[PDB]
């Protein structure tokens, strides 16, 4: 019995929109967004986490910094490392740099991560309703996504299998009175608040896993 709509931004779980600039680090922003919501659920405090800590330090786990990476490998790094620094103490500079992780500045931890059933939008909906914001991969390789402005995004050129961008599902919704009318996923991007709808995009929901949103979803266990 899941809610007809969810929006974690309205419960305090989501930090203001960030900007990855010219660095292939969307996976790091999707991972800090998910950990930010789980740490808030655990402590009641919303603390911005360091994407640069992940960019610089998680190559042992398989990430490649500004050249790409995966949210699961980020949650694996946080677990093996024993922590993750705050954004304030380890600022983002959008280029690969030397790892400067400082344990004394850690404000988050995880014990591992949970994988949502691949390809299953109903498993993703259950995770979003019961856990908090969820890290997901999607195909953002389209001019229509770069210039998205408002409304429910639906792009026929979208692939559900070949993905290139890590984002955060912070909720889901519908329009009008019928909960099944015009359903959408509420997605936080990391291209600045100026992109899209104050930094977010509504992606069509329950339309055959549009853009791959439920193909490779996960969240950290705290």
């Amino acid at each position: 019995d899941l809610p007809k709509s969810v929006d974690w931004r309205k419960k305090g779980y989501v930090t203001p929109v960030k900007n990855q600039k010219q660095c292939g680090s969307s996976w790091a922003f999707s991972a800090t967004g998910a950990l930010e919501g789980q740490m808030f659920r655990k402590t009641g405090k919303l603390v911005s986490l360091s994407e640069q800590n992940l960019v610089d330090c998680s190559r042992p786990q398989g990430n490649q910094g500004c050249n790409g990476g995966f949210m699961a490998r980020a949650f694996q790094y946080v677990k093996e490392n024993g922590g993750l620094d705050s954004e304030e103490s380890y600022p983002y500079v959008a280029v690969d740099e030397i790892c400067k992780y400082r344990p004394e500045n850690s404000v988050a931890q995880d014990t591992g991560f949970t994988v949502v059933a691949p390809g299953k939008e109903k498993a993703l909906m259950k995770a979003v309703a019961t856990v908090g914001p969820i890290s997901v991969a999607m195909d953002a390789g389209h001019s229509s996504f770069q210039f998205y402005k408002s409304g429910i995004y639906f792009e026929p050129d979208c692939s559900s299998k070949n993905l290139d961008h890590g984002v955060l599902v912070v909720g889901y919704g519908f329009e009008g009175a019928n909960s099944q009318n015009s359903k959408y996923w509420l997605v936080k991007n990391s291209w600045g608040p100026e992109w899209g709808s104050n930094g977010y995009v509504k992606i069509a929901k329950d339309k055959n896993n549009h853009c791959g949103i439920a193909t490779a979803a996960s969240y950290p266990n705290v």
């Binding site: 990855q20 600039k21 010219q22 660095c23 292939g24 969307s26 953002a140 390789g141 770069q146 290139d164 961008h165 291209w191 600045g192 992109w195």
Partner: peptide, 5 residues
């Protein structure tokens, strides 16, 4: 993906 400049 990165925003196009």
């Amino acid at each position: 993906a990165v925003a196009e400049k």
